[PDB]
């Protein structure tokens with residue numbers, strides 16, 4: 001992608017068509033002639049190009065109109081509408097940028113944002129950029145939320161977010177230019193080491209990884225081609241479909257063997273009836289040769305009847321000897337046809353125990369990416385966001401992912417150690433009740449015109465609730481919270497004093513012994529120059545490892561490394577850090593997944609703002625007061641940092657259009 | 667449109683495994699027992715054949731007669747005429763057999779013999795007596 005067309009792809013927009021959101025803001029254009037639409041589309045793409053070519057300074061309307069050319073810079077109110085639209089919905093002038101026009105003299109409207117995560121910080125940045133009084137309430141003693149970086153000296157290791165999932169269309173590509181992010185690629189070579197310490201040969205590493213990807217395509221065939229999506233009233237999960245496909249492959253292996261050995265009995269039984277015909281023919285030939293001999297003992301001269309007897313027995317014996325030769329000819333073809341079938345037997349098994357364990361490692365890597373056991377992912381909707389994956393090599397933050405939320409929090413009114421306990425929204429305004437986390441006997445009251453709630457989806461699931469909503473959230477909202485799934489994921493940081501592994505090998509895997517423990521310390525990371533091994537815990541093991549102390553978790557870590565690198569070449573780590581995101585009261589899990597029985601439509605339900613009832617019976621329809629942003633509210637980019645980043649920009653533009661007015665729609 | 671080349675996911679097989687909870691193990695056991703049943707049925711026929719193969723030991727070599735091809739003559743001698751009548755009585759209309767019994771008479775000559783001496787040798791009676799057996 002290049003030119004103004006590439007800037008549209010970078011902003012996740014089609015360059016040749018107006019989007020659904022643009023139709024609501026420019027209904028006079030999309031309903032008008034095609035010439036007006038293409039003029040509008042160029043102004044939109046050209047404005048995005050100017051912002052992306054230098055996202056460290058603000059792109060004013062005076063700058064956009066200056067760098068435009070006729071006939072595109074003739075309609076000025078159109079350029080003003082396009083620029084004000086892109087600025088409002090976070091497509092331009094978002095993140096961290098030098099402001100050309102300093103902030104308004106006084107602010108308009110009061111907004112309380114619950115949570116200082118990436119989603120909350122992004123919205124607070126844009127809402128304050130629009131000229132509103134924004135205040136964030138964070139329960140932790142830090143910003144970032146699920147973007148937590150561990151630093152002790154030169155040591156840096158992300159306990160939360162770690163990977164940037166490509167830059168092609170990623171808003172983080174804009175943030176990586178505004179913030180001193182040190183992005184480094186990931187070598188996708190992962191040697192597998194079995195439980196005995198010895199490595200997996202390249203023979204099985206490919207013939208199992210290929211069979212793994214072929215099992216996933218098979219589940220998609222089960223879902224979209226056979227409609228295998230409901231099994232006895234309950235929705236089918238990805239784990240169910242995988243076991244069904246595997247059992248069908250083991251079934252086909254047995255069917256091939258039965259029909260192969262059945263070819264042998266069918267042929268071996270032909271040989272049985274042929275040998276029985278040969279043994280009966282040999283007995284007739286043995287008897288006929290005796291009768292022919294006795295007829296020849298009759299010494300000449302003899303009458304024509306005794307002479308015909310010898311000629312007759314000779315012809316009859318020659319005829320029987322002709323049949324026996326043809327049967328021995330058939331015996332030769334059947335006897336070597338049996339050596340043909342018994343030399344090409346079908347596969348003995350589908351997957352051996354050694355193969356099935358290596359396959360379980362790839363299943364564990366899938367349970368890591370989705371942060372939940374495969375028995376909970378929806379077979380139909382677990383890969384719904386696949387079409388919106390960015391392009392490019394996936395990178396990591398060499399200086400720590402926490403540098404982004406720290407830099408976004410610059411210049412914002414953030415109240416740390418402030419746990420929100422009750423959210424009250426009425427027709428005339430809102431009040432947020434919170435306490436100080438260091439001493440809960442100290443209560444704070446915050447009045448505002450609108451509340452933006454970025455509470456983690458696990459916090460919204462708490463029972464009894466950690467945050468009380470007054471009035472209660474409607475059923476369609478609460479039911480959508482219970483339908484969605486919130487996963488679990490854990491890392492183990494091992495800080496040594498020197499490197500004892502391969503510096504060229506970025507990462508190596510460990511193949512567990514049991515299917516029930518396939519995710520227990522299955523992958524080890526080494527990213528930076530510093531001696532920090534990063535062990536991964538995923539799947540069903542993620543929730544069980546939280547109930548195990550740190551010294552025991554490090555014990556199982558060293559037990560794996562001692563068998564791989566040597567019993568003496570593994571020193572004791574000087575610093576150990578183990579995450580417990582499910583036990584974290586401010587997260588209650590890792591991130592969201594499309595659980596079975598849920599769908600992508602629940603992600604849009606999570607974003608619909610709540611509107612209170614009228615204060616007086618017979619009063620006009622009130623204003624939406626309670627808004628929801630966060631990682632769990634964006635349908636096409638869930639469970640990611642850039643998804644929460646975009647979700648914050650979304651509600652910030654929605655709240656601004658509600659309380660500041662959208663003047664760009666005339 | 668079709669499963670990945672190597673997967674065998676027919677609509678019929680999916681429902682047979684997803685019936686009940688243990689329908690997967692039930693199907694896979696009936697194929698394991700059918701594999702055992704067929705496998706030991708092999709070594710039963712495989713032993714029956716190996717036992718019959720030893721009865722055919724030596725072939726039929728002590729029973730073959732040496733090859734003797736003679737000049738296909740033309741004159742029907744008084745001896746060869748009587749050999750033909752007995753061949754018709756025993757073999758009927760199998761001219762290839764009658765030609766081999768006489769030896770020095772072609773198959774076309776045997777068929778011409780059936781018409782020339784049809785009068786004096788009463789071949790119609792000889793043939794209808796062969797049809798009794």
Ligand SMILES: Cc1cc2nc3c(=O)[nH]c(=O)nc-3n(C[C@H](O)[C@H](O)[C@H](O)COP(=O)(O)OP(=O)(O)OC[C@H]3O[C@@H](n4cnc5c(N)ncnc54)[C@H](O)[C@@H]3O)c2cc1C
Nearest residue numbers: 115117118119139145146160161162163420630631640641
């Ligand atoms: C282990 C792990 C690894 C991850 N790795 C990646 C990755 O590699 N790539 C990627 O794209 N994404 C990754 N993610 C997901 C990513 O971190 C999230 O999508 C994103 O950080 C969510 O941001 P948010 O602001 O929506 O939620 P959060 O970051 O959780 O922000 C919500 C804030 O609300 C605060 N809060 C909670 N309860 C209260 C309360 N009662 N009162 C007041 N405040 C409260 C919390 O402290 C938190 O600061 C990972 C997540 C985890 C857990």
Ligand SMILES: CN1CCC(Oc2ccc(OCc3ccc(NC(=O)c4cc5sccc5n4C)cc3)cc2)CC1
Nearest residue numbers: 163165186187188189190191205365368369507639640
């Ligand atoms: C040989 N064969 C062996 C296996 C290889 O497969 C791999 C090769 C290298 C491999 O690197 C290790 C690796 C790299 C990245 C990630 N991703 C994340 O952590 C992540 C990104 C995002 S976005 C929202 C959540 C999230 N998460 C969790 C996890 C592991 C991982 C697997 C492929 C080659």
Ligand SMILES: CN1CCC(Oc2ccc(OCc3ccc(NC(=O)c4cc5sccc5n4C)cc3)cc2)CC1
Nearest residue numbers: 163165369370382383384385394592593594638639640
């Ligand atoms: C589709 N895709 C599959 C993997 C292929 O190769 C790789 C691509 C990226 C590679 O970086 C590592 C990596 C690892 C995990 C994910 N997972 C997610 O982002 C994700 C999707 C969904 S749906 C609900 C949650 C969720 N999440 C979290 C992303 C990237 C590593 C390898 C490329 C094509």
